[model samples]
Target: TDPRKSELYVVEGMFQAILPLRGIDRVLKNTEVQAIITALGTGIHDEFDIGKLRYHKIVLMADADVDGQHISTLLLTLLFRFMRPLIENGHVFLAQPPLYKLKWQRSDPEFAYSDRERDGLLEAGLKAGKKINKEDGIQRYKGLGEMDAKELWETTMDPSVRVLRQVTLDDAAAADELFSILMGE
Candidate 1:
């Protein structure tokens, strides 16, 4: 589906991949990267023509780990360099998937973003005298792949429950400088 006409679209960033930010010529010469730039550009242009310039949000969802953060950064770098309008106009976002799911038998699972939060939830449950398996009760999601289809939808894919952080260019110059420094060898 064309996310430009729809509510959202997601792009997954793989491990250890770097953008062709080494040079504009490099990215334009890369068919794969060129295709992405075309898709995103056309989508935005279409939205502009339809009077919904910033209607659809491009969500970047990754695993909840350091690798995931790296992936997010790489994608962000690509977007900012080739599709600055997306970030400037707030059409790009990062999905915040839960790191852990705390469960005590059949009750609804509680989501936590960090080890500290997960630990605190378990501690609270223990003090409340709720029965738990201790070691097995806390389901740690090392990555998005660890989550089943249904669990993924409920925790990260579902718009109602999922947390999204919109990518913004609060200071374009500052961001550009930072990207230049980070992307430099």
Candidate 2:
């Protein structure tokens, strides 16, 4: 017997393969987390009110690259397209992961969101007596695992410092056309 939490079971099925692969069993002891993990849905997965979500923070994590951005955008599009209430209710977010890491010392570190920021940091480093030519140590992060827990927390998980961008629909018709174009190609 399946204690389905949502009506969209197929969409939930898509994530079924992730549990074993990601070692999600560790969190199974938490009843709320277990319900969420085992929940099945096909149309609107985890589509519920924030008050009933069982968890306070719901983050949509993705890569810092363009494709990851597109995937996140597409999901937001789907949410707004079908469940406009969630968008209007401020229940969605676009995760901003750093694209580059600049480390100078053991404790001093910074993250750059783009190539321009990276260049600016390098230029600033030169001004501050750190040589970029030899060993300024600039690392481009193409994946999350590349960032250690400290770096990840500083750039992504810091509560007081984190930046949240909520998606809003200015032109629903335009979004529809863009989605149609994107899905077509």
Candidate 3:
């Protein structure tokens, strides 16, 4: 609810593609990683102190696709590695970017988070006799960047209406194990 007291950290470089996770050495050298440390004011590893944290809710936002989820997977694994306390304290979160946007003739566009919901919206619109314009048909978002400012604001960023998925220790433990086996660590 307060931008003045908030920090939005993003990962660049090989992010559009899920570049697999690395050990603490490489992770510590990463620019976004350094910024994350600076932003949270909570030093990682032995120096981490949640009391110095700048914000309570840290959001992981990426495109709504397998690649985006893959990014989260890698990022989440890294988080559990050195910043386990962040997830344990319920500060980490994942943003739900819409997979599809349904645009009908006479109404504001509606968002669908899944394939079933997109189909359901179309089916319901058909049954309701709403005119679905072919020119501006269902928008299947491969990623969030395709969405303009207003659409992004209304669907994923706005606090009141946006859906944020929280990250917990329970979720990270399983993910950490998966990555541990995945990267063969």
Question: Candidate 3's error at 109, in angstroms?
Answer: 1.3
Using lDDT, give the best candidate's number: 3
- Give TM per candidate: 0.68, 0.58, 0.79
Name model 1 segments beyond 4 Å from true.
1-5, 11-35, 41-55, 64-66, 115-130, 170-179
Candidate 1 residue 59 C-alpha distance from true site, Å = 0.9
lDDT of 2 by residue, 1-185 (tens): 22122111111111111111111133335543344333322234445443443222334556656655454555455555554555565544555778877876644777887789888987888788774434547787867667786776667656556555655565333555666787688
- Model 1 gets an lDDT of 0.62
Error (Å) of candidate 1 at residue 44 is 9.2
lDDT score of residue 74 within candidate 1: 59
Could you tell me which residue pairs clash in candidate 3? none
Scored against the true structure, residue 151 in model 3 reaches a CA lDDT of 88
Candidate 2: where is the Cα deviation over 4 Å?
Answer: 1-57, 123-136, 171-176
